[PDB]
Amino acid sequence: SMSGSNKPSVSVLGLGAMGSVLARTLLQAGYGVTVWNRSPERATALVQEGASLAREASEAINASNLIIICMIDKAVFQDVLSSLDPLLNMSGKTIVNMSTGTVDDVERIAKRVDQHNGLYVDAGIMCYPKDIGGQHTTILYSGNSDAYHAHESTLKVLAGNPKFLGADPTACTPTYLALYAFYFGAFAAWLEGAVLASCAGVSVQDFKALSPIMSDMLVDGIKTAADRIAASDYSGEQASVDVHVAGQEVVLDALQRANAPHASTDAYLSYCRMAQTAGMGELDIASLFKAMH
């Protein structure tokens, strides 16, 4: 392939907000990078910094033995595969798909890559572009173990704290989507609180300064609730579901009187009421897991 500082070639397909930064990060670490994007405008800055732009997705695939996909979704990578010569030889090449998509997409893609004699790793980026290259940054991976481990050092340029979740190409997606269900539900909750605080004359900077109290409590609460769910041990001596409900009905009242949105609080109260309906009123809040299952 070649190098420069004796590093192998990598290809990046998709140069949006995330893909462009994957390419730049590899270039800056001394990797040869071939890029491809549906629209060529996005490649100009990368080309000026030493990337090669491929005219066709096929040429980007041909250029490297490590092919990183970061398009809007897995479905559009299926369309890219469909426009390849069916006999394009991907022997010795590892496709790493970092695009958001369904387990059905992953299954279809793994099959098509296998038909080309390629190796397939599914992946999920657990950060915003600004944190790519971070020692603490996580990308999730699942699929061909030999292929992942062969490219592990290269992929570590993008994220210093990767997690290999197992050999099943479909393992990454459900975990990835579950962690982002948590992340964005929690981020909406934070906004919902920041808006209530603001309505009471607490600046967003002052609410930011207090937020770690609750981030620390949530780190501990997740540990606590996970250990209880593992043990099916929902004894209510810390706090009952019923007391959680009485308290959060006061939070709702405050949101309604502030004319602040309360969709996140409505969601939590609905899960509480599920648990009460199931006779879990006296139990620990961890019992919501069983009521929700």
Ligand X SMILES: NC(=O)C1=CN([C@@H]2O[C@H](COP(=O)(O)OP(=O)(O)OC[C@H]3O[C@@H](n4cnc5c(N)ncnc54)[C@H](OP(=O)(O)O)[C@@H]3O)[C@@H](O)[C@H]2O)C=CC1
Annotate each residue in 68-107 with x if it binds its own copies (CB under 8 A) or - if it does not, as one string. ----xx--------------------------xxxx----
**Is 136:163 a contact under the CB 8 Å cutoff?**
no
Q: Kindly tell me the sign of the dihedral angle through the C-alpha atoms of 128, 129, 135, 138.
A: positive
Q: Where in 48-67 is the site for its own copies (CB under 8 A)?
A: none
Q: In whole angstroms, how close is the CB of 30 to its own copies at the nearest point?
A: 25
Q: Where in 136-175 is the site for its own copies (CB under 8 A)?
A: 136, 138, 161, 163, 173-175
Residue closer to its own copies, measured from CB, 270 or 277: 270
250-259 contacts at long range (C-beta below 8 A, 24 or more positions apart): 254/196, 255/192, 255/196, 258/195, 258/196, 258/199, 258/200, 259/199
Partner from ligand X, its own copies, none binding residue 195, C-beta < 5-8 Å depending on class: its own copies
Tokens at 238, concatenated = 């810390």
Q: 49, 149, 253, 256: which one contacts its own copies (CB under 8 A)?
A: 253
By the rule CB under 8 A, 200 interacts with its own copies: yes
CA distances 181 to 53, 70, 189, Å, are: 35, 20, 12
Which residues sit at the interface with ligand X, rule CB under 6 A?
A: 14-19, 37-39, 42, 70-73, 76, 79-80, 99-100, 125, 128-129, 238-239, 243, 247
CB atoms within 10 A of CB 63: 19
Q: In whole angstroms, how close is the CB of 263 to ligand X at the nearest point?
A: 22
**Is 33:12 a contact under the CB 8 Å cutoff?**
yes
Q: In whole angstroms, how close is the CB of 106 to ligand X at the nearest point?
A: 13
SS (H, E, C) 233-293: CCCCCCCCHHHHHHHHHHHHHHHHHCCCCCHHHHHHHHHHHHHHHCCCCCCCHHHHHHHHC
**# binding residues, its own copies (CB under 8 A):** 105
Q: In whole angstroms, how close is the CB of 60 to ligand X at the nearest point?
A: 12
CB atoms within 10 A of CB 32: 21
Element (H, E) at 228: helix 204-231
Q: In whole angstroms, how close is the CB of 13 to ligand X at the nearest point?
A: 8
**Is 125:98 a contact under the CB 8 Å cutoff?**
yes
Annotate each residue in 212-251 with x if it binds its own copies (CB under 8 A) or - if it does not, as one string. xxxxxxxxxxxxxxxx-xx-----xxxxx--xx-xxx-xx
CA 266 to chain centre: 25
Q: In whole angstroms, how close is the CB of 153 to its own copies at the nearest point?
A: 21
Partner from its own copies, ligand X, none binding residue 38, C-beta < 5-8 Å depending on class: ligand X
Q: 45, 128, 277, 279: which one contacts its own copies (CB under 8 A)?
A: 128
Partner from its own copies, ligand X, none binding residue 42, C-beta < 5-8 Å depending on class: ligand X
Partner from ligand X, its own copies, none binding residue 223, C-beta < 5-8 Å depending on class: its own copies
Q: How many CA atoms lie within 13 A of 234 on its CB side?
A: 18
